[PDB]
Design an enzyme around this catalytic site. Structure first.
Site, PDB file in Angstrom:
ATOM      1  N   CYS A 184      25.687  26.930   2.123  1.00 56.94           N
ATOM      2  CA  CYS A 184      24.589  26.665   1.194  1.00 56.94           C
ATOM      3  C   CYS A 184      24.939  25.544   0.208  1.00 56.94           C
ATOM      4  CB  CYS A 184      24.190  27.946   0.450  1.00 56.94           C
ATOM      5  SG  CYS A 184      23.325  29.142   1.499  1.00 56.94           S
TER       6      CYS A 184
ATOM      7  N   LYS B  10      22.023  45.494   3.881  1.00 56.10           N
ATOM      8  CA  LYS B  10      21.407  45.012   5.113  1.00 56.10           C
ATOM      9  C   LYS B  10      22.224  43.820   5.588  1.00 56.10           C
ATOM     10  CE  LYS B  10      18.450  42.699   7.026  1.00 56.10           C
ATOM     11  NZ  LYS B  10      18.426  41.896   8.276  1.00 56.10           N
TER      12      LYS B  10
ATOM     13  N   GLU C 284      17.469  21.043   3.697  1.00 54.33           N
ATOM     14  CA  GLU C 284      18.763  21.620   4.063  1.00 54.33           C
ATOM     15  C   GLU C 284      18.914  21.742   5.585  1.00 54.33           C
ATOM     16  OE1 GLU C 284      21.352  25.193   2.131  1.00 54.33           O
ATOM     17  OE2 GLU C 284      19.416  25.801   2.958  1.00 54.33           O
TER      18      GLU C 284
ATOM     19  N   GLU D 179      20.841  34.216  -4.188  1.00 51.91           N
ATOM     20  CA  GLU D 179      21.785  33.163  -3.869  1.00 51.91           C
ATOM     21  C   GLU D 179      21.143  32.394  -2.719  1.00 51.91           C
ATOM     22  OE1 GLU D 179      25.341  31.779  -5.478  1.00 51.91           O
ATOM     23  OE2 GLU D 179      24.824  33.904  -5.711  1.00 51.91           O
TER      24      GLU D 179
END
Ligand SMILES: Cc1cc(Br)c2c(c1)C(=O)C(=O)N2
Ligand code: NA
Ligand code: NA
Ligand code: NA
Ligand code: NA
Lengths: 494, 494, 494, 494
Positions: free
Chosen positions: C296, C186, C393, C262
């Site tokens: 990230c 996906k 974040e 992840e």
């Protein structure tokens, strides 16, 4: 799916390869390489001796110096060069297969489908290892961080035989180069041509100069020089068990260079009574007669259970009498000539001893053609352990069939040898296969097959068939030098 | 917390050990082993020779036969037996340490806390490897199942030196027995006793007869017999580089037995100007003087950066002048005697050569006591790379301090040697530490420490300091023979 | 070396990829994908949903059936196809870089030299692993032969984010294909185009139909469909932590498919007072502003020791001011726009909250252009741990600079986070580096560098930054199902 | 050689074990544990709940702090502690075996000779792993040194079932403590006593306070509190597939802690017509009836080839009828009671179901005594795939025998299940054994044996039988968090 051969391929490389350049020998001497199918000289080749080896070693030492392009190169990029080399070998596949047949004698069909396929697979396999052969981090006692570096062993001397010129070269260069070593390679005087052309491809691929150096020459001269050199860190030799001893003495005599050996064999092919008759017969034929019997792990002791002995012998004899011997560039030829005069005579001499000692000659026995080193497929029956043909490596198209009763018996007899390169077991029974595979003193045991090599699975000898292993991860071991780094840390924690 | 020693430990074992029984030599001849602190004889020891070695190899071969208790024993139970032997050694720890000191001369405090601790840890580390050294299942091309068996190499000839009698024994038996090999051990004439008592514990532990066989004697006789034996599969040697060459020659000339060598060094200990002075001084002192200087990896070339040279030298001299030489059973004793008369004289001869070839004698330089082989802690300064004491292994309490300027310079001088067992770097700087441990050609590089050995961390030489590695997972590699089994299958799938 | 970009690259693939053919969604619905530098639609893309995912999984299951081309294929040939795929990516490299920049917004130079280089290196790395991930032969107790097969886990659902569209695609396919799995992938609605083009190359490379299937669409529909599917065996998800939690719950409440994640981070970049200042500044800038802050593992908490804080801050702000923001095809551009309007708003909102809560806004702070989602390079000084911009974040070009005094302080402050993806230590001192590398709770700790990624080294989170590792040997673990085979034999022998 | 049991063994430990001390529940609540042979209460045990778990997790976390005795402890010493624990368990073997029988119901002879033996082997095996699970040094691109540390995953929740209370505790503790983790363990309410005594031995072994904590209690309270805990890093669970789903959901719903699951199965035991009938009948009986049928990998689907079906069924029924059901402390007893009333009823439910859906009841099928929870050995013949008793785990002494014809047929029917924990194959033919072992979708395939476990060989489920593996080297993977450290260096060389 076999493209047509060029039956007279041009020779482009016949010199000493040092620093990606071609050199005549210091002495200017040369030697002829011969076409074993015709016995005519193909061309002259530079005869390297110690002085030429000294040049090769210095070139290699410098390519290996800390801060050189080869040493600073990313590991992944060593893998990339190996794949590039393989792509170039694939571009010139038909040429190289034809040049191999011309110089070696093996059928061109076999050269193309087997030999070069296996070269390509070996190089591409080891390309993959270049950046994957990890050292270790180690939970040592005390306030320390300890780890290993897998460094290259350094300047590697590699002496290769004539039965599989190209493939043996790949078997050696693959591990060496993947681990960032430099090499000085001595090719066999009988078959120097394919390996020298590969050197030109090594230049084309982009390997830095001095990383791979090739010195054609004789055994007692150039070979010995590499064996005894004070700045060669490691030697790898594939040849006779006799010479293997000379190699290991030379290393202890010189600089304690690391040694691995791939030597000869008298491999037992064991056919149990419950075996598939047809498959067993065809595979035992292949096991012995492949590559004109010029195979270190050739099934030269075919043990057959007494209940099926007679049928097996008759079928094997029929298959041997049908095996087509002739011009190796003919697509129908299954067996080409032997490699040279020396081996031709040697084989004929061994056939004579078989007849002398009372082994039953069932077919062949003599010369197969007026021109070239051709020998008829030969089968001896009722062979006894004590016979010379049952004990010594013949390395020709000469089959020995032996009779046995029990499984305990054949284990003892198979293992009663100073060799242990390979062995095979044919049987449908699970327990017999496992019992025999365990008990046989052989570096490779095949079950219901023979001569099944993959770049992924290691190959090597027990006892005097050699030491260390080639292929697989195991093949990287002898080309690595292990360094432990142990650092005091403020406080060790898990 | 050290238990008070028995300063005159009783000797119980002093014969040849074959098949869990005690034998006199065929010749019935004995040799003396001396207490080096006094020069007096402890006892007579059987003098093993070729015929005794032959008996031991027969006993080893029979115990290694397929179907025997040792070959059939579970991998896991091999570990239990090694753990049992460790317990037995710990049980007798106070006694063994005393006897080690008695026969070798090293301080009892060190024997108990250092030697026997590392013996126990080695045996217990390798007990853990018995059932974990896996072979592989390999994704080979075609309809085949291919895998490797990690089998014992077989009969292992093990020759150990006199400098760490018990520890060198454990280093050899640990990985050999964990992987199911059988052993013929040759202990050194100067220090046979402790190894021979351990034989009794091997029998008490439950090891089957013939799995470990010990034959004390001389090098030219018993040592040469093992290396040249026709039915020994593998030889491991620890000793001088001179003798290591003879072993490898003997292997090549006999049956191509597999060889591993742990030899001498002239290891560089590099002190950068940013080093912690007090730590570096103490560690460099330990690096050289540990075990009466009788360490293959002794920091015998102390390279010190010119900015801190003078201070380092003064501090180093004061430490050496204060080092307590005396009775090894006295708890205050740092340095016992040298091992025998030959070494005593040899070391004195080197001391003479040092002051004769222009090196600056700073302290010691003579005999330390009028009975036994005690030598003064000796320190040379202004040592140059050309000097004999800078080049040759002294193997005594004699220190060489050399001056350097740049990091490029010291890498060149440190590596310019035929030895490469170990090295050290002292620096607070991250880049300096990585630059050096990378560039130094040595099996082990210690950073901000020295002589840190762990059973988990491999150890062995570059160049002519040896080949192969002991300790860690790497120690099992030389005691394993690899067998590929390749089986035809109906249809291979991932 | 960057060739001239086609700045309006044609879109060839915009459908669902199943069985090496292109499909409209069953519903026929399409969604727009946007050029984030302009805010305009590039093209429409088929909106895959549950029904389409059902077809892709059925195709995957069919291609994974025992005896299929994919299952029977030699392991080494899987590697050849991966290298072939890489060559085809390399052939179309210029196009792919331009298309990546068009849909994502990252500078074309970075796209060419970084993203595609890493794609190529990742795929070629794992091609090498295809025929090397061995199972084991195991020395079990009793009369048995035990070994393990490393089999493919099976039908793998792979959900990739939008920040590195092509690279994250390679990170997933590499290991999964090397180990012979089949994939339903996906791709992100914001960046589906390059992944769909690579699907054309997958067909061209020669991968059997059904081995790789790609379903572009929405998260809550197409993503959830994979994660909840009863015939998917394994899901790998890369993206936000919150959705990470949704994936692990969906695995649990369906068929217990294996999960690897992840996820996000708030990674600390720690500048000790003894670091190289100019290097530290440039690496800290790089650490945060790379890929428009959409990493990230971005160094989003920059800890600077108090003695160097003022200088570090001045230099970082000066660097942030000169950073060129604009059209990603312009060569002078260092920073492109953010990926879509939602991120554009979210980031600006975090900037609002930084000012409110009392962090000193030192530069930037707002919108950088009236066209496209360009945000000014923004720096916050005197940031405290409790501040929202210090905890959460941001995923944008917004730097946080925090002051600390001691090494004990910074460890604890760095570790006091629910995240643990990466960290960095800048220092010249050996012990500070070792102390910090050990103590930091992070999957990757960089020493004197940042964002150093290698196909060979594993990457992944501690704590809620994910579970499992990608890259390296470790990245094969999640894609392997281990099978033990244990077989009764007549008599086990070592 | 089995010592006479104490049939009413004393209970010494019945409380919550935190920080090497015994505690009542915060609520002071206790629960009765029952003797399944008599249905009578043995004693009361402290009932742990959320608050007790929280106390346990704080103690675990404190023991795991950087600088703690357990984090600083040498890896080799963790090894020593596990070995000490094993010796202490062996010392108290007779008692533990008796206690196991009293609380669980299994034959005392089996507890002593099988369970306790396997506990000892598991713990001693993992003792050996403590200092051997190496990280890697990695040849990454560029001027960098890169390596992995294998750190412990951290605070590990361990939830174990009642069928093998001691053994399952060992399978969890071994790998966790070997790799330096800390544990909060929840033992089953049906069988908590043996685990609590072992906690005493863990203290006596010298494991630091807090390294192993045990909370007895119920699944929805104590168990759920562990799975949902925000400071638990990892949960390993063994039990039913249904609860396994609950754990994975809880883990995602909380803090994304790592999850491994060991769940149920409906394992096929395939009997080929060429099998040893006598051996196959006894092994299939053992495969099903072992431990009162309360084994996750019980051969609960016995596939017998049609030609041998009638004889196999006849022999299987006779063997079932001869199985002695009685007092588990009586040496004659083969089968004890089921563990509790819940399982008792469930099994009777499944037996009823079999009868109702057309399975042919050949023997047993009822209650075997008026006291305790004893069920008659039950055999169903002519079972079909679509039957519930052929699909769902009964976990009782209820045998299903199915008929098949072709090897291709049985593969499909064996693999048509949501479970895949184990399988077996009985045949004398090599090719059938390899074809089936490959084709069967199961974590363990036994060939000519069943329930052969070794600490060395991994165990776990395909599909919904679990994820991850216990035992062997593989057992360590789930207890390791991998940290990559990548360090910039002056100049990288090979
Ligand atoms: C070293 C080596 C290599 C190959 Br390919 C072989 C052999 C030996 C044989 O004996 C054989 O039949 N094929
Ligand atoms: Na020739
Ligand atoms: Na004395
Ligand atoms: Na977009
Ligand atoms: Na109970």
């Amino acid at each position: 799916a076999v493209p047509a051969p060029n039956q007279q391929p041009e020779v482009f490389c016949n010199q000493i390869f040092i620093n990606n350049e071609w050199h005549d020998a210091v002495s200017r001497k040369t030697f002829p390489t011969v076409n074993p199918s015709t016995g005519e000289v193909i061309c002259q080749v530079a005869e390297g001796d110690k002085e030429d080896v000294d040049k090769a070693v210095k070139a290699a030492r410098a390519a290996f110096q800390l801060g050189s392009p080869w040493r600073r190169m990313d590991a992944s990029h060593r893998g990339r060069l190996l794949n590039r080399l393989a792509d170039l070998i694939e571009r010139d596949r038909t040429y190289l297969a034809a040049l191999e047949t011309l110089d070696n004698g093996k059928p061109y069909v076999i050269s193309y489908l087997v030999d070069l396929d296996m070269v390509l697979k070996c190089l591409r396999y080891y390309a993959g290892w270049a950046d994957k052969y990890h050292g270790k981090t180690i939970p040592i006692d005390g306030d320390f961080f300890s780890y290993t570096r897998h460094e290259p062993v350094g300047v590697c001397g590699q002496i290769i035989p004539w039965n599989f010129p190209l493939l043996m070269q790949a078997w050696k260069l693959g591990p060496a180069l993947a681990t960032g070593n430099v090499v000085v390679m001595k090719v066999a005087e009988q078959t120097p041509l394919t390996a020298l052309y590969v050197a030109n491809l090594i230049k084309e691929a982009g390997f830095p100069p001095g990383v791979v150096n090739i010195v054609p020459g004789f055994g007692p001269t150039a070979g010995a020089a590499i064996a005894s050199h004070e700045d060669v860190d490691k030697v790898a030799f594939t040849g006779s068990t006799e010479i293997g001893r000379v190699i290991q003495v030379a290393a202890g005599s010189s600089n304690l260079k690391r040694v691995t050996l791939e030597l000869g064999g008298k491999s037992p092919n064991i056919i149990m009574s419950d075996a598939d008759m047809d498959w067993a017969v065809e595979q035992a034929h292949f096991a012995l007669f492949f590559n004109q019997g010029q195979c270190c792990c050739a099934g030269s002791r075919t043990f057959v259970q007494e209940d099926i002995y007679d049928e097996f012998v008759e079928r094997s004899v029929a298959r041997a009498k049908s095996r087509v011997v002739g011009n190796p560039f003919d697509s129908k030829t299954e067996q080409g000539p032997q490699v040279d005069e020396t081996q031709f005579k040697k084989i004929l001499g061994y056939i004579n001893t078989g007849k002398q000692e009372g082994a039953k000659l069932l077919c062949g026995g003599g010369i197969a053609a007026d021109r070239g080193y051709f020998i008829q497929p030969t089968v001896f029956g009722d062979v006894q352990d004590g016979m010379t043909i049952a004990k010594e490596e013949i390395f020709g198209p000469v089959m020995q069939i032996l009779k046995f009763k029990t499984i305990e018996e054949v284990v003892g007899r198979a293992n009663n040898s100073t060799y242990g390169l390979a062995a095979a077991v044919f049987t449908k029974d699970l327990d017999k296969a496992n019992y025999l595979s365990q008990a046989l003193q052989a570096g490779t045991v095949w079950v219901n097959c023979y001569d099944v090599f993959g770049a992924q699975s290691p190959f090597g000898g027990y006892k005097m068939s050699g030491s260390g292993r080639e292929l697989g991860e195991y093949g990287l071991q002898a080309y690595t030098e292990v360094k432990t780094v142990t650092v005091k840390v403020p406080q060790k924690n898990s």
